[PDB]
Symmetry: C2
Subunit: 301 residues, 2 copies
């Protein structure tokens, strides 16, 4: 079964680490870096890793039951899986699938539709935020702590968190949260990735997301788009080497814009050409060319 | 080139009319109906119709510039950032809300001009698509917010969340150009062609910001099918593709359905109780058939 990439253009792709469209391709203009995101992790032969799940509108969402305590009002959410199934802390995953995979304050909307009590079916929804550096951000243990200026939430009722953007100018998108709290280390992580040679840089799919105040830039970079995650998962094409050579191509004219290494682990490196941003045709997209090895030398893009 | 369906399960699929996961399959428990949604419209050979675009998180979103219950007049652009041309042969800007109701969400800004370039803000808003100023075909929509903390002249984004009031009519199209200028370039209405058949819907249950509204949004095919048909562009060998909902473990056909070339599904009405399907099941293409194929009662 031949390995293939989706033929969606840049403006037709979705971020795999935040529910947003892709705005541009991006490489670090200062240096090469090492990253370890947990959403948007899928090998080329279709193995999901980290906290990666398949629904693009559920990335960084939470689902569960509100638990009352004992101005910013605390809202403890006892989690279930985003697909409604019970959450099992013994699963070999870093946290509930879809959990926020970086340090920062994410603002969004928490909503409820009552299933028990005297008002079954009654609904409410208000802005909330989740600080993933809070010691009660414990999605591996099965709970997160939200905060809201509204106390209009019903105890014991189903509660969904939908993320919107930056709740504060405090994002560190490559710093993993402590999924089990201050005491216990992270486990079952998707591996860290980095260029294997000097002169190479990871190529990111960059989105710019909203912010509820301040001057935060709103950058979220993913290794592959969510549509690629869905594609590899379903195709499960055998990887014939550690490195697939791919080209950003103009499908109308056949012109090759630049070449890149698509690693079996599920991320892209390009040869550093080291200045100001990447210009690609809006009708173009990546196309698989051949299976190569690590000793392939990339032409500066 | 053979026709194929994605193998994603129900809980792995996205609604094509709202940014939400699919919750269940659904048919009308009383009668056959006629529907004409404008999002989630794609023929089996990959022709997008209506206001359908490809990004699943952008459905029912708006993008534009704030011009001037505090009213927020938004001059629209396309969701992919390109300018919006009202002369395009579309019912409205791609991704626009395609039903009558109050949709609540968050409006956000990041300043690009003035003395505070880069400054941001975001607040809950709602859009009443029955408002005379809901005119996404002309290129503008009116939002309302309890906060005044918005800067005019600045890029403005609306992200939908759910019901702003218990007033949804998901099959009643809005007046995209206002009370004037009846809708144009619409994706066609669809309905079962025979008695005893019903349209099979992919149903989402979305949030609500007050009241007892059910939150139902039904789509003809999931957004992943839209993306898949668009890329594959497999020629339709007949007007009706026979598909079966299968259990991949056992290979058992749970039920069969007609997948019409226009891009919607009908099943043989079996009356009673909501639909029981295994979590690991998915639709797969079986063969090309015609209108005279008799579906087994679902």
């Amino acid at each position: 079964k031949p390995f293939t990439l989706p033929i969606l253009t840049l403006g037709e792709l979705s971020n795999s680490r935040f529910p947003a469209p892709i705005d541009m391709l991006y490489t670090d203009p200062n240096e090469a870096i090492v990253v370890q995101p947990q959403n948007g992790r899928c090998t080329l032969d279709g193995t999901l890793q980290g906290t990666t799940q398949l629904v693009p509108t559920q990335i960084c969402s939470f689902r569960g039951t509100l638990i009352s305590q004992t101005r910013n009002h605390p809202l403890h959410v006892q989690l279930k899986n985003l697909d409604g199934t019970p959450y099992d802390p013994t699963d070999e995953v870093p946290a509930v699938l879809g959990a926020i995979d970086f340090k920062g304050t994410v603002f969004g909307v928490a909503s409820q539709r009552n299933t028990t009590g005297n008002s079954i079916g009654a609904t409410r929804a208000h802005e909330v935020h989740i600080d993933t550096t809070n010691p009660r951000y414990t999605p591996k243990l099965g709970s997160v702590l939200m905060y809201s200026e509204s106390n209009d939430f019903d105890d014991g009722q189903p509660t969904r968190f939908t993320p919107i953007g930056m709740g504060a100018d405090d994002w560190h998108q490559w710093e993993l949260p402590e999924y089990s709290g201050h005491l216990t280390l992270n486990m079952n992580l998707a591996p860290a990735v980095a260029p294997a040679f000097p002169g190479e840089r990871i190529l990111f799919f960059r989105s710019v997301v909203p912010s509820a105040g301040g001057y935060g830039s709103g950058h979220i970079d993913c290794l592959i788009p969510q549509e690629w995650v869905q594609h590899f998962y379903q195709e499960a094409a055998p990887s014939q080497s550690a490195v697939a050579l791919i080209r950003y191509v103009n499908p109308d004219t056949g012109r090759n814009i630049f070449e890149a290494k698509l690693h079996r682990e599920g991320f892209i490196t390009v040869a550093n050409s080291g200045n100001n941003p990447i210009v690609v045709p809006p009708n173009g997209y990546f196309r698989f060319e051949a299976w190569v090895n690590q000793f392939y030398t990339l032409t500066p893009m």
